[PDB]
Paper text:
Third, we demonstrate efficiency gains in ligand-soaking experiments for structure-based drug design (SBDD) approaches by solving the structure of the anticancer target tubulin in complex with both small molecules (some of which are approved chemotherapeutics) and with new photochemical affinity switches for the optical control of tubulin function. Due to its key role during cell division, tubulin is a classical target for anti-cancer therapeutics including drugs such as Taxol and Vince alkaloids. To demonstrate how this could be exploited for SBDD, tubulin crystals incubated with single ligands were loaded into individual reservoirs. These reservoirs (loaded simultaneously into the multi-reservoir extruder) were sequentially measured without disrupting the low-pressure helium environment of the Prime chamber and without entering the beamline experimental hutch. For this part, we determined 7 crystal structures: apo structures for both TD1 and T2R-TTL, T2R-TTL complexed with four ligands known to bind to different tubulin sides, and TD1 complexed with the photochemical affinity switch SBTubA4.
Residue numbers in the entry:
A (entry chain C): 1 to 440
B (entry chain D): 1 to 42, 45 to 276, 284 to 360, 369 to 441
C (entry chain B): 1 to 42, 45 to 360, 369 to 438
D (entry chain A): 1 to 439
The structure:
């Protein structure tokens, strides 16, 4: 049991959803038709992968997922793509008219027409679970559907499932692939509204992923396909703890007890390694020590911040592949000594480590190399605020001249909600500062 | 699909309207008979936006043609692609307009507007998901300018939440001596400010100056001007007609381009104007005052927002870099209180004939030069009460003419007020 | 028969519980199927202290296995002696406790607790003369910690005049890395101070040191840690399971080991320290045994005895050996460290011998000390707790289950009282 | 003829009691099945031995004894021992749980539920007596039942047999074999309470018996069986005068008259000689003079103390075997000059002497060599007060911190009963001090 339902919202959520589910199928040996020849328990079972895949009588393994978008063209690609047979039609939900990059339209005007249906389809999945753990919500900050509809859905999930946990995979907007001047408004609006409905939220900064793909993968002009594929390896490492079984493995629930000290401080920073091209992987075997020492390089982080100019409140290292406890220990030592790791006074301990012996995997036709071992670090640092800050600034620069707000008010929104948000965000920036202040 | 309903009212509206359907039909591989005969599936992915797919695999433009004086309509029905249109969508009058805005808007135009509305309604009800409307017209004549805006106002009542888009040709003495134009333009601009969502200002002064100084065609004809218009219209609708992620529909464009409701008048630009040129050259030219389809120097104002659209096979890396250079090198001419306000689309299908082209859509405060020039003229006639007869004749009052005067003054004031504003 | 009811709760409780039942089953000549196969009648004389007898002359451990998650049980069930336990005595849930004392004690735990008490009650009505209960659990998690202490409290209510004894594994950041363990531990010590008669403090910090420093196990596993716990648990329960004159039941032990009600936390010790798999070429001389068991390096709690004073000590020697020499060496130790035993409890060191040795050893010795130095263990936990609690860090995990922060303040207070009370008697 | 009922309380009492009755049997020629060929009156008698054994019409001689222990293990041994047929089930009383080395649990908690049963069984034996003289009570100071229950019983026996003598045999706690740190508590509690109810108590210090076994018997680590066989030699010597024809100490009352001038100072010191290893290869048979001298060596006392630094109030010499009056009187005058034997002024300096011609019977297979003559000295000397001082000092050491006191208070005893029992012992030490303060 302990199932997890995935909800992919808007283009980013959906496109990222495709990449993850493809990766999951590769990892568990599931084919595009849903058959998994290595699974004897036909029709049903209690295996680890069943937390993400349900089983039909015919032996099909169906993702515990829902795809939702306010227009059809992105999800149509799933309906016709290699994995179309993988999903039951009721899992792919589409409307006719999108939010037009307007939080207001996704939350109110358009969202209101399709929200009931989405919740019903989610109810049908939940009802198939013997022990529903929680939800995983993938969505962009900047789109009207990613922002406006997500927040509506999270409010409605809080009502229908109470305190059942909700984790968020959020695409933080970056100029290099942004599609709307208003993405800051949508980002602050969506973050405020979901802040109290979300238990833990993993931001991915598109500028950070863009830069890593150029530098580490030598991609001159990364596409969404480049980004979504690296973004997936992070999700797979946060989820592997639940999709695979092992002796040194740790469930995300234990990590969360350590990665969320206070209710609102629920935004961990993610780092993956090794991100290398086959051209450079050839003639190079990144050691457990090198990969770990990389998770502390301020340029291999999926959110642009300087972890050093701040204090750590938790560093959780989830390893995968040819890793053995002895090597992990030596590494953490070398790092602590020859590196800048300052923890807070209120955090006895500080490091949590785990190993998933299931090897790392790479999609045929990818730009990442098949390594024998990899590491994902989830760290709660007071430096993630450099992101809330930068975004908050863009917002304050436009709201002062009240730019583009006529589009939001024309759909019902009021200036108040725009200020109610800036204040929760100023509070969070203070909260992150106070959590680092030493004690008396 | 996401349908747009095209309406062209008047000679200019129908002339550039007709040229528009030729260019984009060609780009999508539709012949005069409605049959598709093209080489790429990209030409059909979004063809429902402007075309209805009837039975017989024939594509018919979703276009309504309107005029208060036939013949122009007749020439259009005879011109290339004339038989591609639906015969029921021809809606024309008899009394004509006589270059009189009041006749197009309050009298002759009104007695025919109901006939037009039935065609619009029929076309709209057929739409799976109506985007909104797209009108082509001049502001100097009577039908296009007068009935055109009346038609918009009537549409807006039935489709209050749809996008209203207009290609509007501004009058230039370099190209027309009807003398009364500045009256019809000013009364037209007064209406566009309140009732349209986004308006492309196609300034005849710029087309003449490009044909004369740049293209070197002394004494140029309407056919010459409309080659620039058709080029331009094709450019600014590229992202609406092909698969893409940026400004793929009229509302997303409006959200990126219109920061304040009234400041919705766009400066179009095109490069190259017609040896082949590179991506750096393409970028430099499209931001140069001499490639603007509106008589305005962008160095005389600041950009609120800009969309750039590159068409053809080229290095996306090269495009991104060159775009950053031009924003940085020209940082002073962009308002700092709208971060990341220049968006860039790249459609890999070039237009017919060129290997790559750039299209510029600017929301610049320098467009007040276009309105100031019209305003100057308007006052240079209304100050003598000249020709107030044609308009009062049809029962219009004294005020109206004055309200349009101060209303457009305000518009110029707002563009200025946001040009001078600072981030701190 | 003076029966004991054994309860094991949670992951640690069941893992060290199961190994305990495997170790003493072997010592008593019972096999995986519950059949007696021994060479001595000395093994069957008190067999009923821990085992029930059915038809088939089979022996069934008087043991209840409790957990809030379905694993662990499966593990125990498939273990070598998985089949000896009574099936009706497996009581488990599906939610789990998420290493959260509040879930074990107040919410998830409460749903399962009543069905546990029926099996406890079932086992107790079967006993001719019930001594009381013993529970194995850790204090750092949620089930053994939170639900474990709930079970003690509820069981005490039904049997207020029986001995309650626990084997309580103290958390150490050397062995685990879950940040809330000091919260669960402090909450649990407060309970144990109020509701148990005797608690053996089994400290994972000392188990780590023994394995890593003394036995040179550079990749220690819980299997290694539990090898020492089971050796220690067989040793400290020897007086209950074999004929003998001293500490032969839980109440007589409490009267000898607990001079003041709250001071009922024992330091176990064992000698020789051995790592499983290895073989003993030379046994140790009674002298060597005696010197070692009093040595700080052989204590199962990570506290230096030289930093405090012994109130009471029990020593249990097992194996064939000179009763005369044991006396001589025990006197030497007392005469040699006579400043470390309080002067106002005369003859406070008591010595037992049992002829049956434990598996693999020719000679062993088990130390049970009530030393004031146990305060260092509770001080260590207390320091970790305050580092977090003074900022209310991670508290939402507990308040979200209905706990108030006042209840944390009390647990810290009670534990600081306990520490200072040990300090009171050290300066006597 | 007057009978004596024996009462054995707790493990010490039962195991020592079990030792004595076997030795009584070997001395009187009573077989394990109760048949006594020497007995020629079948089914009845008023012989000296009938004071301890009654008779049945089937010729069975059964001890006039009652065993009581709150746990069954020890009494089970009696029920299955080699002398199981001697006793019948009604005289063997056991409980379920014991006093857990807790005087309060033996006296109040577990005592109250069994006191009336024990008294009933004792009444049943009592009704079969034509002239019951009283009781001999065997118990430890340190156990919960031996200390706590005994005091209750002693009290009830004074109520239901107000007109009877009560003798005690008391095991005094020694570290070498003790099993609870709290034994000094139990010792002072039971002494305080039984003191007013006991006419004469023989204290046997396990420490003394432990070292005599080591030194004289070559027993490396004496067990209870070793200790108890020696103790039975002493107990038997003291009661010999009740079970055989004679004229000294012939009834319980005569013990108090001869040994106890003061009621509270009723603790005579016992000394026994000679103790010879049975594993020894023949030994210089000691003379009357030599064994009489041995009575004034500390190493043969049942309580280590130094009678030189105290005063006598009474002395009884009991000889068994080849002894005639001339040699005793000639040994006495010798000792009286060689040794410092100082009686209290208000007391005649003199010895009461008793000779039993039957020599000591030794249990076959025991540790004690058979001898031709032995002697037990009973001396009421103030030197025995040393044992109260030792005991009381340990009590004071623990009580000052209230260590372990909560175990007693939890069983319904009050804290005041501690300082009260201690006060009585404070008074008892001063009584010894007054009576023996010349120097
Ligand atoms: C007996 C139970 C145990 O096996 C004991 C340790 C922890 N786990 C088993 C697995 C294990 C261990 N280390 C792992 C690293 C990655 C993945 C798995 C492991 C374990 C080991 O090295 O194998 C023998 C181990 C773990 C630690 C460990 C030692 C250790 O080996 C014995 N340390 C005691 C702590 C540690 O934090 C510390 O305080 O330094 C001593 C330590 O720091 C370093 C750099 O050594 C370290 C090592 C990863 C760092 C961060 C997290 N903390 C928690 C405990 C600590 C660890 C062994 C449970
Ligand atoms: N990393 C990543 N970002 C994406 C992807 N698709 C969109 N985005 C980002 O998402 C933001 C815009 O949101 P979208 O997902 O495009 O839009 P939407 O959520 O569907 O909302 P509407 O368009 O209003 O219906 C921009 O910052 C994009 O860069 C993707 O596949 N990967
Ligand atoms: N000489 C001798 N001393 C004994 C014997 N048994 C116990 N003792 C001593 O008596 C004290 C303990 O008294 P026990 O007889 O064990 O106590 P009990 O009467 O059984 O009391 P509880 O069992 O505690 O209720 C200790 O000092 C023992 O050393 C025995 O057989 N012989
Ligand atoms: N670029 C362009 N401008 C035109 C064309 N026809 C007319 N105009 C302009 O439009 C104005 C006259 O509008 P007109 O078509 O006569 O309006 P109508 O009476 O409503 O049909 C003049 O200022 C002309 O400059 C044309 O074909 N191309
Ligand atoms: N010595 C030992 N400690 C253990 C074992 N299993 C868990 N622990 C410790 O117990 C604590 C975790 O408690 P856990 O058993 O998971 O608690 P639960 O959630 O109530 O079942 C940590 O401090 C671990 O180090 C074991 O088999 N042996
Ligand atoms: Ca299966
Ligand atoms: Ca007779
Ligand atoms: Mg979308
Ligand atoms: Mg006993």
């Amino acid at each position: 049991m302990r199932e997890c339902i995935s909800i992919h919202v808007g283009q980013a959520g959906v496109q990222i959803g495709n990449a993850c589910w493809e990766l999951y199928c590769l990892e568990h040996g599931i084919q595009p038709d849903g058959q998994m020849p290595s699974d004897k328990t036909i029709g049903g079972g209690d295996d680890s992968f069943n937390t993400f895949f349900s089983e039909t009588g015919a032996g099909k393994h169906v993702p515990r997922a829902v795809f939702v978008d306010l227009e059809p063209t992105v999800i149509d690609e799933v309906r016709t793509g290699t994995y179309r047979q993988l999903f039951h039609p009721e899992q792919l939900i589409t409307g006719k008219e999108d939010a037009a990059n307007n939080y207001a339209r996704g939350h109110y005007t358009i969202g209101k027409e399709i929200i009931d249906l989405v919740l019903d389809r989610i109810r049908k999945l939940a009802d198939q679970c013997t022990g529903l753990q929680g939800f995983l919500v993938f969505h962009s900050f900047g789109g009207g559907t990613g922002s406006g509809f997500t927040s509506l859905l999270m409010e409605r999930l809080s009502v229908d499932y109470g305190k059942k946990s909700k984790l968020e995979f959020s695409i933080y907007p970056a100029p290099q692939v942004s599609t709307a001047v208003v993405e800051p408004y949508n980002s602050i609006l969506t973050t405020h509204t979901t802040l109290e409905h979300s238990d833990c939220a993993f931001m991915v900064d598109n500028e950070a992923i863009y830069d890593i793909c150029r530098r580490n993968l030598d991609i001159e002009r990364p596409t969404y396909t480049n980004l979504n594929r690296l973004i997936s390896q992070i999700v797979s490492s946060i989820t592997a703890s639940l999709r695979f079984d092992g002796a040194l493995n740790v469930d995300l629930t234990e990590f969360q007890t350590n990665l969320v000290p206070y209710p609102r401080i629920h935004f961990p920073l993610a780092t993956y390694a090794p991100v290398i091209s086959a051209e450079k992987a050839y003639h190079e075997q990144l050691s457990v020590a090198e990969i770990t020492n990389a998770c502390f390089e301020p340029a291999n982080q999926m959110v642009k911040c300087d972890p050093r100019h701040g204090k750590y409140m938790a560093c959780c290292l989830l390893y995968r592949g040819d890793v053995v406890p002895k090597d992990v220990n030596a590494a953490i030592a070398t790092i602590k000594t020859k590196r800048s790791i300052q923890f807070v006074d209120w955090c006895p301990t500080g490091f949590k480590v785990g190993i998933n012996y299931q090897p790392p995997t790479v999609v045929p036709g990818g730009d990442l190399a098949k390594v024998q071992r990899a590491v994902c670090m989830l760290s709660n640092t007071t430096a993630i605020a450099e992101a809330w800050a930068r975004l908050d600034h863009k917002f304050d620069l436009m709201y002062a001249k009240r730019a583009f707000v006529h589009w939001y008010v024309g759909e019902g929104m009021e200036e108040g909600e725009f200020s109610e948000a800036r204040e929760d965000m100023a509070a969070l920036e203070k909260d992150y500062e106070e959590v680092g202040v030493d004690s008396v | 699909m996401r349908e747009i309903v095209h309406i062209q009212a008047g000679q200019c509206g129908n002339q550039i309207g007709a040229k528009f359907w030729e260019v984009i039909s060609d780009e999508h591989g539709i012949d005069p008979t409605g049959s598709y005969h093209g080489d790429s599936d990209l030409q059909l992915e979004r063809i429902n936006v402007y075309y209805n797919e009837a039975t017989g695999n024939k594509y018919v433009p979703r276009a309504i043609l309107v005029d208060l004086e036939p013949g122009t309509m007749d020439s259009v029905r005879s011109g290339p692609f004339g038989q591609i249109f639906r015969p029921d969508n021809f809606v024309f009058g008899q009394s004509g307009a006589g270059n009189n805005w009041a006749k197009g808007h309050y009298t002759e135009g009104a007695e025919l507007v109901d006939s037009v509305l039935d065609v619009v309604r029929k076309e709209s009800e057929s739409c799976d998901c109506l985007q909104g409307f797209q009108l082509t017209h001049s502001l100097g004549g009577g039908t296009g300018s007068g009935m055109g805006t009346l038609l918009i106002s009537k549409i807006r009542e039935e489709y209050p939440d749809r996008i209203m888009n207009t290609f509007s040709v501004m009058p230039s003495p370099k190209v027309s001596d009807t003398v009364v134009e500045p009256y019809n333009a000013t009364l037209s601009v007064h209406q566009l400010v309140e009732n349209t969502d986004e308006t492309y200002c196609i300034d005849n002064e710029a087309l003449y100056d490009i044909c004369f100084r740049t293209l070197k065609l002394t004494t140029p004809t309407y056919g010459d001007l409309n080659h620039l218009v058709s080029a331009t219209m094709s450019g600014v609708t590229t992202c609406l007609r092909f698969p893409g992620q940026l400004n793929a529909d009229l509302r997303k464009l409006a959200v990126n381009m219109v920061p304040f409701p009234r400041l919705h008048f766009f400066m179009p630009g095109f490069a190259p104007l017609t040896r082949a040129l590179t991506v750096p050259e393409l970028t430099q030219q499209m931001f140069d005052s001499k490639n603007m389809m509106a008589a305005c120097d962008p160095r005389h104002g600041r950009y609120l927002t800009v969309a750039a659209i590159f068409r053809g096979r080229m290095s996306m890396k090269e495009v991104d870099e060159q775009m950053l250079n031009v924003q940085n090198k020209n940082s002073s001419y962009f308002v700092e209180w709208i971060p990341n306000n220049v968006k860039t689309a790249v459609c890999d299908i070039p237009p017919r004939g060129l290997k790559m082209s750039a299209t510029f859509i600017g929301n610049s405060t320098a467009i007040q030069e276009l309105f100031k020039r019209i305003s100057e003229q308007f006052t240079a006639m209304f100050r003598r009460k000249a020709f107030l007869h044609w308009y009062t004749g049809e029962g219009m009052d004294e005020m109206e003419f004055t309200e349009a005067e101060s209303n457009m003054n305000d518009l110029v004031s707002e563009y200025q007020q946001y040009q001078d504003a600072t981030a701190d």
